[PDB]
Design a binder for this molecule. Structure first.
Ligand SMILES: OC[C@H]1O[C@@H](O[C@H]2[C@H](O)[C@@H](O)[C@H](O[C@H]3[C@H](O)[C@@H](O)[C@H](O[C@H]4[C@H](O)[C@@H](O)[C@H](O[C@H]5[C@H](O)[C@@H](O)[C@H](O[C@H]6[C@H](O)[C@@H](O)[C@H](O)O[C@@H]6CO)O[C@@H]5CO)O[C@@H]4CO)O[C@@H]3CO)O[C@@H]2CO)[C@H](O)[C@@H](O)[C@@H]1O
Ligand SMILES: OC[C@H]1O[C@@H](O[C@H]2[C@H](O)[C@@H](O)[C@H](O)O[C@@H]2CO)[C@H](O)[C@@H](O)[C@@H]1O
Ligand SMILES: [Ca+2]
Ligand code: NA
Ligand code: NA
Ligand code: NA
Ligand code: NA
Ligand code: NA
Ligand code: NA
Ligand code: NA
Ligand code: NA
Ligand code: NA
Ligand code: NA
Ligand code: NA
Ligand code: NA
Ligand code: NA
Ligand code: NA
Ligand code: NA
Length: 701
């Protein structure tokens, strides 16, 4: 019974015996502590994880008719990770002094962390913020009602929580230094920097920016646009399933209103204005790209002498972060979450359309979704390369925001968004729309994607791959993208396999609208690296489930592809159940990347010394000079030296001895096998739980 499987996993996730949550009721990234992938420690948590918790409680609340758990989850989010604390210290002091005519001061991004700190030069005057005034008039405040992306839930970095000292969970930041700063190469620092850690008199600021003076003490937060959007997607469903408490519905509306900051160029530069390398400030909504960019960030002074604040949007947009179910919820009567601001719903209505166009634009010749686009080439408004394809005057990028690893390689970035487009096809059809350009785009995209993905899903069979991760056909040749991929397969009862990554080449054609789409014959996805990721399985299932269900609502029966998607869904759910260990549905994974715990690649500028949260001097003596080819002049320490408390982790020992016995520092290769782990990730187990739930709701009933 899929309903019983849902309830079982729900209770495994929620059980105080299992450790998915902290003593303060806050979900962790994972049960295990020793893990690094986007958070850099398993008992961090993310806005991601909160949004998934919400999704979990909505479906539970549906089945039990008790919405208390959803409300408690929202309350917990508000208390610990949204930096608005009406009835306590102000967690955004001096936000009121924000200047919407000069939202922030320009600085260039750099191609390597070695080139930071970047000068706050104001070379490009920032454009007008056109939504500040609406937000103030609507809510009586400009305090940002969005989740900060990263919380140190056990205070493992030891910074404490300055503006709320009785909370153990402290707001922390990592990424700050451009597209080559992997998770391994960032330096964790407190969002609220009173300069009591970091370099004396400077805190951590001077790693990242230079200005004429010593940096003032200051605070800053950064959301992740897909997380707040998923929170809103969850509440969409809650309301569809009967939830009707306007106290919480209104909070989702407010979150959606502030999420519009995700639609603006970093420095409010006119969209397209940097095509030839000479950007200029936006007027009205001229800096609105109507997509969800990677983040919005906001900051200001700490203390009585620092009466200023600032906001940035972002210029880089990744397909994988778009959420058109949230956009629909926020923009129509049937969606039900339209904000009360003058243009919130209408901005989201445009976004819904632009998101769908972006997916169609980015879809490869064989059906996979390519990375995205930017309004700030190289992150400094460089002129677009000759011949570069564009989308609304923004340049195509195969790896938006991050290159280490390239951000659209992971197959999870296919499942996540296509799950939502599937949902949206279903939503549109259920709402009586078979004819709009929006439904035709959503349908066309998901239909082609489903066809695409089914070539690489194996249940009870094991695909044949080579040593470099390529899938092989029955004649033993590499399968290098293309439609009608026929992967060689040996019998393997009880196993499942999914693709792990895509290797991208080429470009889409420049966008001219849906009626002119070319099918992008020059954009290729090579799908690779079979693996057993149970988070991705859960997301795929839902994609296939909602797609199947939509086809039946549309036509009266499962279509040809709809049948195949339903059957794949059912089969994946059936095999996955065997991998429940009593705590979650899990598999073992090799982590060849875990040499990066030990590699000296964490950059510090010359002349900078200070104290890390854990008490250690940084960069300290365990360093090598930075690579002169990366354009800096400083040093590298390692991830592990930076975080000496990691050596107290129970798993550290085995990792270190595995490194010592298997990794060859000379060749950069694991010679006697790579480290191996079985992780219980919060989001992954939610994606599996909700998969059983929705198959029950949409297909069984
Ligand atoms: O005139 C009044 C006073 O002015 C003071 O000077 C101010 C100045 O006015 C103001 O403009 C300036 O503002 C800059 C900040 O100092 C600086 O910290 C800020 O840097 C941004 C940076 O531009 C941006 O790239 C960065 O993005 C990070 C982000 O923080 C991080 O969370 C995110 O992580 C994502 C992961 O990549 C992803 O895997 C995961 O899912 O989600 C994460 C979240 O999305 O990654 C990105 C990079 O990709 O954020 C930082 C801020 O943290 O830039 C501001 C504008 O340039 O500050 C000055 C003070 O220093 C004077 O000092 C005073 O004399 C005057 O009175
Ligand atoms: O940033 C995307 C996403 O990454 C998740 O970890 C992935 C990682 O990207 C992938 O290469 C690895 O092999 O599998 C893991 C687990 O599915 C991470 O768990 C998320 O927090 C993050 O948003
Ligand atoms: Ca790097
Ligand atoms: Na709060
Ligand atoms: Na801990
Ligand atoms: Na407190
Ligand atoms: Na606490
Ligand atoms: Na990363
Ligand atoms: Na600064
Ligand atoms: Na994210
Ligand atoms: Na109420
Ligand atoms: Na409100
Ligand atoms: Na709409
Ligand atoms: Na398409
Ligand atoms: Na196909
Ligand atoms: Na294989
Ligand atoms: Na195109
Ligand atoms: Na992995």
């Amino acid at each position: 019974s899929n309903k019983e499987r849902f309830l079982t996993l729900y209770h495994q996730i929620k059980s105080d015996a299992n450790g998915y949550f902290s003593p303060e009721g806050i979900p962790y990234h994972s049960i295990e502590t020793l893990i690094c992938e986007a958070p850099d420690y398993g008992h961090m948590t993310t806005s991601e994880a909160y949004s998934y918790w919400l999704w979990l409680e909505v479906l539970y609340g549906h089945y039990t008719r008790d919405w208390s758990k959803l409300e408690a989850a929202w309350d917990n989010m508000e208390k610990y990770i949204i930096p608005v604390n009406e009835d306590g210290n102000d967690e955004q002091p001096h936000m009121s002094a924000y200047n919407p005519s000069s939202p922030a001061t320009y600085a260039s991004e750099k191609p390597y962390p070695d080139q930071y700190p970047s000068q706050l030069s104001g070379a490009r005057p920032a454009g007008q913020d056109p939504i500040d005034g609406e937000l103030k008039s609507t809510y009586g405040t400009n305090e940002t009602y969005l989740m900060h992306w990263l919380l140190d839930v056990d205070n493992w970095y030891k910074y404490g929580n300055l503006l709320n000292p009785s909370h153990k969970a402290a707001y922390v930041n990592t990424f700050q230094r451009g597209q080559q700063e992997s998770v391994w190469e960032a330096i964790p620092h407190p969002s609220q920097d009173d300069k009591s850690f970091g370099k004396p008199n400077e805190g951590f600021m001077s790693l990242f920016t230079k200005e004429n003076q010593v940096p003032a003490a200051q605070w800053r937060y950064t959301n992740a646009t897909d997380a707040d959007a998923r929170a809103i997607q969850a509440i969409y469903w809650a309301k569809e399933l009967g939830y009707n408490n306007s106290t919480y519905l209104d909070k989702a509306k407010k979150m959606g209103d502030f999420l519009r900051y995700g639609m603006y160029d970093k420095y409010f530069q006119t969209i397209g204005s940097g095509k030839q390398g000479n950007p200029y400030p936006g007027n009205g909504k001229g800096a609105c790209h109507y997509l969800m960019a990677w983040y919005t960030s906001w900051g200001g002074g700490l203390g009585d002498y620092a009466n200023w604040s600032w906001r940035i949007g972002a210029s880089h947009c990744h397909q994988g972060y778009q959420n058109p179910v949230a956009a629909y919820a926020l923009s129509s009567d049937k969606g039900g979450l339209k904000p009360s601001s003058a243009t919130g719903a209408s901005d989201w209505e445009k976004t819904l359309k632009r998101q769908l166009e972006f997916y169609v634009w980015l879809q490869s010749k064989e059906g996979a979704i390519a990375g995205g686009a930017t309004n700030s080439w190289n992150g400094d408004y460089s002129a677009y390369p000759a011949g570069r394809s564009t989308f609304y005057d923004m340049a195509y990028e195969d790896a938006p925001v991050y290159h280490d690893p390239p951000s659209n390689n992971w197959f999870g970035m296919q499942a996540w968004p296509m799950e939502r487009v599937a949902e949206l096809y279903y939503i549109f059809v259920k709402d009586g729309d078979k004819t709009s350009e929006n439904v035709q785009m959503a349908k066309s995209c998901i239909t082609k994607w489903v066809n695409y993905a089914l070539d690489y899903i194996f249940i009870g069979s094991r695909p044949v791959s080579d040593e470099e991760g390529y899938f092989l056909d029955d004649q033993g040749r590499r399968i290098l993208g293309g439609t009608n991929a026929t992967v060689a397969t040996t019998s393997a009862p009880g196993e499942f396999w999914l693709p792990g990554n895509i290797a991208w080449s080429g470009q889409p054609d420049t966008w001219n609208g849906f009626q002119s789409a070319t099918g992008n014959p020059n954009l290729t996805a090579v799908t690779k690296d079979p693996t057993q990721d149970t988070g991705v399985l859960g997301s795929l299932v839902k994609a296939f489930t909602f797609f199947a269900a939509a086809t039946k609502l549309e036509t009266g029966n499962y279509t040809a592809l709809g049948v195949r998607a339903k059957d794949a869904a059912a089969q994946l759910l059936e095999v996955a159940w065997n991998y429940n260990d009593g705590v979650g549905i899990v598999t073992e994974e090799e982590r060849e990347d875990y040499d990066r715990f030990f590699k000296k690649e964490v950059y510090f500028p010359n002349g900078w010394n200070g104290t890390f949260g854990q008490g250690n001097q940084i960069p300290g003596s365990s360093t090598i000079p930075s690579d002169p080819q990366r354009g800096g002049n400083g040093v590298y320490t390692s991830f592990a030296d930076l975080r000496p408390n990691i050596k107290q982790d129970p798993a550290w020992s085995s990792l270190e001895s595995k490194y010592q016995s298997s990794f060859n520092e000379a060749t950069g290769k694991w010679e006697n096998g790579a480290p191996v782990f079985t992780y219980h990730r919060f989001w992954s187990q939610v994606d599996m739980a909700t998969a059983y739930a929705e198959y029950h709701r949409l297909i069984n009933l």
